[PDB]
Amino acid sequence: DPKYSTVGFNIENSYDRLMKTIKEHKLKNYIKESVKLFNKGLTKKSEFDNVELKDLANVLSFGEAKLGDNGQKFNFLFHTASSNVWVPSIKCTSESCESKNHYDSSKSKTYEKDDTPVKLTSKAGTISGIFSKDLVTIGKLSVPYKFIEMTEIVGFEPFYSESDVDGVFGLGWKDLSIGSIDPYIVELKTQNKIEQAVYSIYLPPENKNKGYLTIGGIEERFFDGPLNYEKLNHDLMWQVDLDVHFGNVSSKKANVILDSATSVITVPTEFFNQFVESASVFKVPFLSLYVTTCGNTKLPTLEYRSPNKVYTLEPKQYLEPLENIFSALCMLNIVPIDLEKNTFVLGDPFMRKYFTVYDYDNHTVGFALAKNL
Amino acid sequence: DPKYSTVGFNIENSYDRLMKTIKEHKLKNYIKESVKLFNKGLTKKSEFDNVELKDLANVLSFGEAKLGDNGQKFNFLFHTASSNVWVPSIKCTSESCESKNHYDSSKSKTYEKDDTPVKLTSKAGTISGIFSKDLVTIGKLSVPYKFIEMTEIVGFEPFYSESDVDGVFGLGWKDLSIGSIDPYIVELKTQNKIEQAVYSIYLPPENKNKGYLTIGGIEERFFDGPLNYEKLNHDLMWQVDLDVHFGNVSSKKANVILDSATSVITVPTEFFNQFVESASVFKVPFLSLYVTTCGNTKLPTLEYRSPNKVYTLEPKQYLEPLENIFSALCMLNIVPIDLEKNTFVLGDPFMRKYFTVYDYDNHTVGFALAKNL
């Protein structure tokens, strides 16, 4: 067993969702026949294009965490930019809430009132609730934490109601409160339940529906070779300064965010189009879907260069097989999306190669060559 | 039998050529699956676009005409803008010429020298030859005519060599010579072999690989109702002034050419796009091919208005069935192509409805409702 406290979590990935879309809309032979056409090759001609940062999220989730001494069960998803944890109140108005697990302050001996109101208003939806202090367990680790009890939830549909998820567990920095509530992982450290304010994400190569979160230490057994460290360029983001080259295409002094919840590698639009020009990659009409032969010899190693380390992705690391649609066919797990000027994100593909460490104490992030388990 | 001299001719149409392209490139299920997609309907997104006036020509041809008293056999195609007739010389350099039928001045008692050089230079190719006078028969009608004996032929490839055609028989006005050689049909009249300098084209509805040319008269039996006449707006073109409306889309004082050798109805680009917008017509990606359900209730009657007559095309007249690809599927026999400002052409679709008359004496053109034989 591991030295430090580790929890498995499940992932619903872009491949699954794409797969579901294909059975739903009967799209196989369309894709099959379009590919044949490309191969023939009669295409030649050069809102899929429109983002969305929504559509690229995977849902990394687990149902082992629990609130209070009675141990009230909840299904969380992890979110790497948020500091707080979020749960449905038993006092939840909305009809979203009705099929989910609820937090009942009353049923827990360890509950302490806070009642301070919080309000998240965003593009997908609107959450209204109050802070509440209780024992927050995972399941080795336990500590009193102030979390948010949600009283009314509006939006995030149809996702929320269709997902068996109840709420959000913050593995990030951003706290909605103004009473400077530390992240759960900092809090475990403040109260001495771990040795270090750190966690690792390990995403096993051979199972893209699984990932492991480990807390309070470096589990040496998840990787080979040295751990490199990079300093964060932002106070409240797992984000880092790096030059990036994909062949002759390059971008100096780029902003790259580590989010294992992002399903793909992202890249500015301009950058993507330069990359993809005459790389022999095919864009399937009427689908957010670029495709190529798995043995494609034109495709470069992706390079993310620090001043004292470069991290790379071979084509095998950024191409998902599609054997069940067309033989030796692969989809490209890279997507063009423009965020703030010069900002890239390293999603699931990167973490399948690199074991990754997120250090709150030292404001560092950590990379190493993932083992194969 | 007919009162006036009539010759059948064969037509290689756009449907055949498209059909050939589909077997060649195995394109059925692609089209099938793309249509399904439209129907689903996941398309929504709005050089096929680049013309070509080449690609729209059918080949209307026949092998019954003959030169000289010995009756040397030739396979001609008809061309409605040219006045002259064109044949390979037995003195033909080029390798194009080698598999074709040849005119040997020497073998014909009725031959008279001319030897005046002519030269056609155009975008597809280059023809060099000399004039030559001989008996030109079809096969009822016969007259000495001055035609062009081709000495070297360069271009028109791969078409020429693949076609079993030898040369071009002019049913038009434009004479390459400067010795004002009348059209063959005017010449028959000058020499009294017919009563009137006129011909009719009849294109039977039920056989799109056949058409009938009739010379020296109106064969009453090919149509129902009155013959309308329109004056030509050009001296040397079968061309006519008409307002044209396709629904709310319209163009006043348009120039419309009658060419039964054109495989489709043409229309300016702007005009076509206005027409096609939300008409529920699908453009198949990577193909010069618009498609729709045969029972489409949004599609208008096409209207070509003269000051004292309007000529119309129902959807049934401008939609070819595609039963062998997808059920109740139809292709649209209308194509967007910009010629001189405001110029439309009435190809094969129109002549399947209208019996058409081409009057050299009176500089008129004539329309009537084709019978069904």
* Helix axis angle, B28-40 to A28-40, nearest 10°: 130
Q: In the numeric block, which tokens belong to residue A101?
A: 């697990």
- Count CB-CB contacts under 10 A for residue B197: 20
Tokens of B266: 């043409």
Residues B62/B85, Cβ–Cβ less than 8 Å: no
Interface contact A286-B45, CB threshold 8 A: yes
Is B30 within 8 Å of A34 when comparing Cβ atoms?
yes
What span, in angstroms and rounded, lies between the C-alpha atoms of A97 and A287? 33
> Which residues are registered as beta bridge partners of A275?
none
Helices and strands in chain B: count of H runs, count of E runs: 6, 26
Residue B37: which of A30, A40, A42 has the nearest Cβ? A30
Most B CBs within 10 A among A286, A287, A325, hence the mutation to make, goes to A286
Angle at B106 (CA atoms; ends B103, B112), nearest 5 degrees: 85
Tell me how far apart the alpha carbons of residues A367 and A236 are, in angstroms, rounded to a whole number: 19
Cβ count within 10 A of residue A307 = 9
How many whole angstroms separate alpha carbon A205 and alpha carbon A354?
A: 10
Taking Cα atoms as reference points, which of B230, B273, B265, B234 lies closest to residue B366? Answer: B230
Query: What are the beta bridge partners of residue B125?
Result: B155
Experimental technique for the deposited model: X-ray
Contact: B30, A37; criterion CB under 8 Å: yes
Q: How far apart are the first and last CA of chain A?
A: 14
Cα A135 from Cα A65, distance rounded (Å) = 11
- Final resolution, Å: 2.9
Is the backbone peptide bond immediately before A52 cis, with ω within 30 degrees of 0? Answer: yes
What H or E segment, with its residue span, contains residue A189? helix A184-190
Q: Which amino acid is at B200?
A: S
Identity of residue A223: F
Residues of B belonging to the active site: 259
Cα(A189)–Cα(A80) distance, integer angstroms: 18
Please give the Cα distance from A134 to B238 (Å, whole number): 91
Residue with tokens 């409240």, as numbered in its chain: A236
Contacts of A40 in chain B (CB under 8 A): 25
Distance CA A214, CA A212 (A): 6
CA pseudo-torsion sign A270, A274, A276, A278: positive
DSSP codes of every residue in A119-187: EEE-SSEEEEEEEEEEEEEETTEEEEEEEEEEEEEEESTTHHHHSS--EEEE-SSB-SSSS-PPPHHHH
B25, B29, B33 member nearest A40 (Cβ): B25
Closest residue by Cα to residue A70 from A90, A84, A98, A96: A90
Q: Which residue of B has its CA nearest to A46?
A: B286
Which amino acid does the sequence have at A190? T
In degrees, rounded to 5, the angle at the alpha carbon of residue B220 between the alpha carbons of residues B218 and B225 is 115
Q: Cβ separation of B286 and A25 shorter than 8 Å?
A: no
Active-site pick, A114, A134, A166, A259: A259
Nearest by CB: A33 against B29, B43, B45: B29
Token digits for A329? 């066919």
Domains annotated for chain A, with CATH where assigned, are 1-59+221-373 (2.40.70.10), 60-220 (2.40.70.10)
> ∠B342-B345-B346 over CA atoms, to 5°?
140
Q: Is residue B205 within 8 Å of B369, Cβ to Cβ?
A: no
**Among all chains, which residue has been given the structure tokens 């560092």?**
A364
Cβ count within 10 A of residue A150 = 28
Report chain A residues whose CB lies below 8 A from the CB of B29.
Answer: 29, 33
Q: Do A36 and B43 touch (CB under 8 A)?
A: no
What is the maximum span of chain A, computed from C-alpha positions, in angstroms?
70
Interchain CB distance below 8 Å, B42 and A285 = no
| DSSP output for A81-114 | TB-SEEEEBTT--SSGGGGS--B-GGG-TT-EEE
Alpha carbon distances (Å) from A218 to A42, A127, A373, B36: 53, 35, 17, 53
A243 is catalytic: no
Which chain A residues are Cβ-neighbours of B33 within 8 angstroms? 29-30, 33-34
| CA-to-CA separations, A259 to A182, A229, A312, A348, in angstroms, rounded | 20, 16, 17, 8
Q: How many Å lie between the alpha carbon of A277 and the closest alpha carbon of chain B?
A: 18
Q: Which residues of A touch B27 (CB under 8 A)?
A: 37
In contact, A80 and A348? CB cutoff 8 Å: no
How far apart are the CA of A262 and the nearest CA of chain B, in angstroms?
A: 25
User: For residue A22, what is the nearest residue in chain B, using CA coordinates?
Assistant: B37
Give the per-residue SS3 of B74-111.
CCEEEECCECCEEEEECCCCCCHHHHCCCECHHHCCCC
Which residues are within 8 A (CB) of B371 and not within 5 positions of it... i.e. 6 or more apart?
A: B221, B222, B223, B224, B355
CA-based nearest residue to A32, from A203, A242, A284: A284
The count of other CB atoms within 10 Å of the CB of residue A300 is 16
Interface contacts A/B by beta carbons within 8 Å: 35
Phi, psi of B97, deg, nearest 5: -55, -25
Q: Do A18 and A331 meet the contact criterion of CB atoms below 8 Å apart?
A: yes
> Dmax over Cα atoms in chain B, in whole Å?
70
- Rounded to whole angstroms, how far apart are CA atoms A66 and A167? 12
B325: chain A residues, CB-CB within 8 Å:
none
Amino acid at A238: W
Q: Quick one: how many helices (H) and strands (E) in chain A?
A: 6, 26
Residue entry with tokens 């790389």:
A279
Question: What is the C-alpha separation between A37 and A35, in angstroms, rounded?
Answer: 5
3-state DSSP assignment of residue B213: strand
Q: How far apart are CA A60 and CA A66, in angstroms?
A: 17
Q: Nearest residue on chain A to B44, judged by CA atoms?
A: A286
